[model samples]
Target chain A: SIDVKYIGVKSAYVSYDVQKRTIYLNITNTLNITNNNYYSVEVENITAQVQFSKTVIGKARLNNITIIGPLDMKQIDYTVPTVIAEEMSYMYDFCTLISIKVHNIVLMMQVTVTTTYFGHSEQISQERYQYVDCG
Target chain B: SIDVKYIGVKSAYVSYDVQKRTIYLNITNTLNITNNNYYSVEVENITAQVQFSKTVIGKARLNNITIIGPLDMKQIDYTVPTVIAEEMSYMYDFCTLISIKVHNIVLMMQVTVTTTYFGHSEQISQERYQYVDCG
Candidate 1:
């Protein structure tokens, strides 16, 4: 049997849209594949989906076909562009000449990956979060 | 009039959390305060909130009061300790095999700022996403 999985986030790109009323985010991440068989296996294209608050934010696919040797683990790199942009007006309120407010966004990400190796197939869905400092 | 703003992020500490089921992310950030008035002013406690989705993950308060003289730009440095742990099955799946991934990790973040000066309150929220290498 073959296994596919996700590790953690690599980077986040956050920017303002036409106005600062909303936010735009991009993500870079890593995924891994493993071969537990005594023989080599060939893997084809992989499809993955990214979600925020249950809404489909972005989609990603394997850039190429890959090969894994006997008793091997392979790594894949991918990205999701422009994930979220919504009104953050609710994030403000406690403010005064003496009082200040800051939001250190500790954001989370969820992704589902489906693919096939050899004649059979496999699927893995993973969810993880990162602390992004966007200003 | 006085102004408070968020500059940018300095560094991100991304370490595989306990059990490898989740992750522990630490963030270092910078906050700035400006004095547009003709005289000096005293700024007091600043409160910050760190969130993952809508859930309040962590909370922080200023270390001490600050004094911003006329035409002053004061900087405050802060850190959020062990803000989050993300769930990932990949780590569990691979940990059982001949393993260790040595690649560096990069990520990004978002934050908001607010303050009222001289009886009038104002708010400014900024979001930035970029490629951050946090091994």
Candidate 2:
């Protein structure tokens, strides 16, 4: 008799969005379960949303808003651009995530962040390792 | 026909109270104007005062306050003293004046600063000009 145990879900992908910023995640397992006949995998529904604004004089104006992707096993792509008067100062930040499901109940999420101001940008990404099956 | 006025109030001698921190005013006129037979001189209660303080914290303390009057027809004297730990710190400033009747209020003032701290003492003095008269 062979005892088959439950394993947590893992995710591997890149993330970029208009509202949410940019994200990257991956998973690793202890044992190999791949054969000559291997299973092909692809992730879907990776998305991002971004909102940006600039300040003119003393007021803040919404310059642009965009939402991009529920991506795949490949690269998730998205961009948000705001165009305004040259003298305006602007600030932009975004959030994004990926959800992995296993055993029809447990789901894990990975998150990423990106922000921009003036002419500079920064990105932060992290993977979540909790098991809450919403399978 | 007009008669010459009799000028009697001439500052003769002066003294200061260091403890009370007071200034003394004085005046001296040579022409006794009374009896050329040689009117011996005498003056009334002429007064003056000076005020001063210190700005430096831990430099010196005013152990004793002194005022040196100029070599006039008479000698002036004054004193101020403090008591504290091994050293008392105080920067004292004073002014003096002299008034003579019919002498156009020959107002003369002097400023003197003295400081003593940590057994170290220093003094600064200056004279001022203005006239005072005994009504």
Candidate 3:
């Protein structure tokens, strides 16, 4: 079985474009992926998302690349960009008003990794959370 | 003719609810409205809006009530609420990231007042702008 563990989240920053009516978040995560099999496992995809309440405001996806050798642990550093949802337009206005300089808000970040070895597929999902200053 | 002059914007504050995926801003404005007519002018409607680029994120409307006598100038204190549009979802995400603790942005505020005197309708529109710190 493939194992996944969280290393930590770092260099997380949020930015805003008033004219575009959107917010963006970039985060770097360190993770340890262990392959128990005797064969190398090929990474299929990596996807990340940021959620507030019940809605997902930002998302990112990484395509296939690299492989983990059998019985080896790999520490991966990944950076993802989250673009805010268009459904949250009101939030854009509220955060950007001249009277409001900054807001501290919390968000959930989820990461999913898919891998394949010898026609067998393994999927692992993990989650982390942090608070950010929203404009 | 009705003349409008910008006094200033004060008590400007911004707040946010990450769970609600929304932000809120409150602003108070001091305005001087002068009536040039000889007779009392019946006020019709007063509306205000806050805009970024081309989209209006916040709006407020004041209905008919007071009368401005000819050659009289009135100093009005007004507060307006600006609710952001959902179309600007990305901005919300970009602005709320942890790395981005705050953002200094600019916005426009517009006020329009309508009045009637001797069966004639007159509307005056004025605009002001300022920079604000957006979370």
Candidate 4:
């Protein structure tokens, strides 16, 4: 039996190699876009900032998401609308799978989504998220 | 035996009602972005224009692509990278399908892609393009 010590999310800024042109982010429940509020993607460890004012109000129940490396994150938006369900290969090409570990705990996360093309807003709730180790 | 014909891409503006906040585009071959030149998405009907400038120097042997209605184009980049090959349902949900018709023709198209996040360029040659009727 394991103990449930930490519940909130812990999003950390992993180092990004400009020579490699890659950014690593540690996603957690604490970093979520609340209901009616929009969120944008951020590239940690870099002097760059990403902001999205288009608020999207939607909820997605993602299951067993595994990502690898060598993908251009700016081109790819982590929206439920952009998710490729069955074709694992397409998603795999961009990400480098380090390892897969199972976790048994609850964490608080948030995300505010917006549509850049269409001026639409939606508040997305990303809570109790299971942070899969990308290593 | 079928006769070979030079079918040029006749992309005509479908007129967008700005009051409705919509822009219609005419995609055709005569307008091709050569290799290394960056191309941006333009709204033919509205004064608003979307440019990628992310010149992708790659060839995609697309297998019969179709799309339909009310999708936020600004966020969806039509690169082979973000496509969900299987579970065709995701693609269907965002796009509306009107009809399917087979045609044999060759047309010229151009695209110049540039990366906003990373400073890179690619000149893409789009020829023999079969334009789909997005009704």
How far out, in Å, is residue A33 in model 1? 53
State the lDDT at B109 in candidate 2.
16
Task: Summarize candidate 3's per-residue lDDT along B1-135 as a digit string, tens digits.
Answer: 322333232211121112233332342323333323232233323244221212122333434434322222234232333333455445432442132224332221111122111222222222332333344
Give candidate 1 regions above 4 Å deviation.
A1-135, B1-3, B11-119, B129-135
Please provide TM-scores, in order, for all candidate models, with all chains considered together: 0.11, 0.10, 0.13, 0.11
Candidate No. with top TM-score? 3
Candidate 1 per-residue C-alpha lDDT over B90-121 given as tens digits, one digit per residue, 9 for 90 to 100: 21111111112222222221111211112112
Q: Worst ten-residue run, lDDT, model 1 chain A?
A: A109-118
RMSD of each candidate relative to the true structure: 36.0, 54.0, 36.7, 32.0
Look at candidate 3 and tell me the lDDT of residue B133.
Answer: 38
Query: What DockQ do you compute for every candidate structure?
Result: 0.01, 0.00, 0.03, 0.02
| TM-scores, chain B, all models | 0.14, 0.13, 0.15, 0.13
Superposed by TM-score, candidate 2 places the C-alpha of residue A9 at a distance from the truth, in angstroms, of 99
Give model 4's DockQ, 2 decimals.
0.02
Sort candidate 2 into its docking category: incorrect
lDDT against the true structure, each candidate: 0.25, 0.24, 0.28, 0.26
For model 1, how does the per-residue alpha-carbon lDDT over A1-135 read when each residue is reduced to its tens digit?
Answer: 222222233322222112233222232334232323232333223344222221232333323334321212234332222222223222221211111132333232211121111122222223333332222
Superior candidate under lDDT, 2 versus 3 = 3
> Model 4: per-residue lDDT, tens digit, A18-53?
223223233222222222322222212333333322
